Amino acid sequence: GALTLGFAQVGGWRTANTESIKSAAEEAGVNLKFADANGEQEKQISAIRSFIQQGVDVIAFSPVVRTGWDAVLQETKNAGIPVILTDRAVDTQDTDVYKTFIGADFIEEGRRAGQWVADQYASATGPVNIVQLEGTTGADPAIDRKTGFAEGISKNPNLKIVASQTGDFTRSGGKQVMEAFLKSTPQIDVVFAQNDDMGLGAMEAIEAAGKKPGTDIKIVAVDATHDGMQALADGKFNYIVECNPLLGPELMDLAKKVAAGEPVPERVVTPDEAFDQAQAKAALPNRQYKLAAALEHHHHHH
Numbered sequence: 001g002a003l004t005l006g007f008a009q010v011g012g013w014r015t016a017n018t019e020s021i022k023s024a025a026e027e028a029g030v031n032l033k034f035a036d037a038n039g040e041q042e043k044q045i046s047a048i049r050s051f052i053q054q055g056v057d058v059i060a061f062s063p064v065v066r067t068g069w070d071a072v073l074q075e076t077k078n079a080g081i082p083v084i085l086t087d088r089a090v091d092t093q094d095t096d097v098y099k100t101f102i103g104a105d106f107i108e109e110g111r112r113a114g115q116w117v118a119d120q121y122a123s124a125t126g127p128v129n130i131v132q133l134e135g136t137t138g139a140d141p142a143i144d145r146k147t148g149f150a151e152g153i154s155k156n157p158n159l160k161i162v163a164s165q166t167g168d169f170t171r172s173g174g175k176q177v178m179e180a181f182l183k184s185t186p187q188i189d190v191v192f193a194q195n196d197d198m199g200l201g202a203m204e205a206i207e208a209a210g211k212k213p214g215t216d217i218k219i220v221a222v223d224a225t226h227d228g229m230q231a232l233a234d235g236k237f238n239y240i241v242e243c244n245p246l247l248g249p250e251l252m253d254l255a256k257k258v259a260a261g262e263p264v265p266e267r268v269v270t271p272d273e274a275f276d277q278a279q280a281k282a283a284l285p286n287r288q289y290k291l292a293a294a295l296e297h298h299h300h301h302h
């Protein structure tokens with residue numbers, strides 16, 4: 001009587017990865033059945049139907065698209081199998097077709113980035129000119145991080161976004177746009193980079209212009225990646241924020257709750273990360289050791 005969890009993976013932006021889900025199920029004693037939709041909704045819908053046929057206790061999936069799940073979700077509800085959504089939220093026209101959604105909040109990321117700018121410059125004695133390197137036009141995290149950042153700086157009107165342009169989430173995109181900003185904007189105090197790569201690009205443009213990233217022009221970015229954190233530890237970025245994807249254990253814990261009929265909230269929040277330079281300098285070199293210790297304990301499951 002191990003709980004059986006069917007999980008239909010996609011094949012996106014802040015997505016729980018397979019190793020995390022597989023390892024968390026081993027740790028929780030959950031019998032995990034994986035399916036791969038290969039980017040395609042009809043194949044995810046088939047995987048869900050096959051889990052219903054296999055009589056799993058709980059079905060979770062990471063929706064490849066927001067819409068068009070109501071029919072298959074009626075089939076799960078009719079089979080009495082609870083459903084948990086991960087990573088991407090759905091649009092539904094029905095009531096109570098899934099138990100809970102677990103995923104990252106991109107508006108919150110932008111907001112925390114904005115709020116750090118507001119905090120750091122609460123006493124600025126001159127205007128604070130912010131330039132923004134946006135993600136790919138129309139991408140959900142790009143739209144939301146922009147919305148969030150605007151909210152985070154909204155209580156201090158000395159903070160002004162004086163230029164905002166897509167760098168398409170890439171290093172070369174961020175570098176190219178920052179060059180343009182340096183040409184068009186005589187006074188830049190802060191860059192808000194909606195991901196680490198664009199921030200790293202920007203840092204190189206700032207350096208090529210003979211300026212000092214992190215001191216002359218401060219950089220606040222999203223994504224606590226190795227290279228982002230390395231820049232921050234080197235004092236070339238000033239602040240990083242991240243809203244995590246699903247980690248794994250909370251999914252396993254929720255799966256147990258919903259299989260037992262315990263009511264759960266319709267949304268469960270993921271954890272967050274944030275680092276200034278001092279915090280990155282402590283955390284970064286250590287990560288390899290914490291990772292290795294954890295992998296060692298876990299390998300006894302294999």
Ligand SMILES: [Zn+2]
Pocket residue numbers: 022023026298301302
């Ligand atoms: Zn494992």
Ligand SMILES: [Zn+2]
Pocket residue numbers: 026027297298301
């Ligand atoms: Zn264990």
Ligand SMILES: [Zn+2]
Pocket residue numbers: 070093094
């Ligand atoms: Zn309907």
Ligand SMILES: [Zn+2]
Pocket residue numbers: 106140141144
């Ligand atoms: Zn969104």
Ligand SMILES: [Zn+2]
Pocket residue numbers: 196197225
């Ligand atoms: Zn990256």
Ligand SMILES: [Zn+2]
Pocket residue numbers: 104105108242243244270271272
């Ligand atoms: Zn968060």
Ligand SMILES: [Zn+2]
Pocket residue numbers: 276278279
């Ligand atoms: Zn600190």
Ligand SMILES: [Zn+2]
Pocket residue numbers: 293296297298
């Ligand atoms: Zn151990």
Ligand SMILES: [Zn+2]
Pocket residue numbers: 296297300
């Ligand atoms: Zn051991």
Ligand SMILES: [Zn+2]
Pocket residue numbers: 298299300302
């Ligand atoms: Zn192993």
